[PDB]
A paper describes a structure:
Here, we study fold transition between distinct β-barrels by protein engineering and structural biology technique. Here, we discover that the previously reconstructed ancient DPBB sequence could also adopt a β-barrel fold named Double-Zeta β-barrel ([name]), as a metamorphic protein. The [name] fold is not found in any modern protein, although its structure shares similarities with RIFT and OB. Furthermore, the reconstructed OB fold could also be converted to the four-stranded SH3 fold by a simple circular permutation. Thus, these ancient β-barrel folds (DPBB, RIFT, OB, and SH3) could be readily interconverted by a few feasible mutations through the missing-link fold, [name], indicating their significantly close evolutionary relationships.
To test this assumption, we conducted the reverse engineering by replacing segment 1 of design-13 and design-16 with the 8-amino acid sequence forming the Z-loop of design-2 (the 3rd generation mutants: design-18 (tkoL2_v1.2_Z) and design-19 ([name])). SEC and CD experiments demonstrated that both mutants folded and had moderate thermal stabilities. The crystal structures of design-18 and design-19 revealed that they adopt the [name] fold even without the α1 region (segment 2). These results demonstrated that the segment 1 is sufficient to archive the fold-change from [name] to OB. Most DNA molecules did not migrate from the well when mixed with the proteins with the stable [name] fold (design-2, -18, and -19) and RIFT fold (design-3 and -4), indicating that these proteins formed large aggregates with dsDNA. In particular, design-2, -18, -19, -3, and -4 interacted with dsDNA even in high salt conditions (500 mM NaCl). Design-2, -18, -19, -3, and -4 might interact with the phosphate groups in the DNA backbone in a similar way to the sulfate ions in the crystal structures of [name].
Residue numbers in the entry:
A (entry chain B): 4 to 42
B (entry chain A): 6 to 42
């Protein structure tokens, strides 16, 4: 990896409850791709 | 564009909300920087 990954923004589902996620604020759409870096 | 956030445990109230799923190696409470590609 490298503390840095890419991921497609999705809509959370019932099966996601309890899973590690980051909440996506307004301005970034479902289907948009984001780069995520643990600092 | 770009934002800072902390990794959280998804809850029932998040169903239907915009999220990114966090892979293994990053824990709840970890600070991440997120930017749209």
């Amino acid at each position: 990896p490298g503390k840095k990954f890419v991921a497609r923004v999705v809509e959370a589902r019932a099966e996601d409850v309890g899973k590690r996620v980051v909440i996506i604020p307004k301005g970034i759409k479902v289907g948009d791709v984001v780069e995520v870096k643990k600092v």
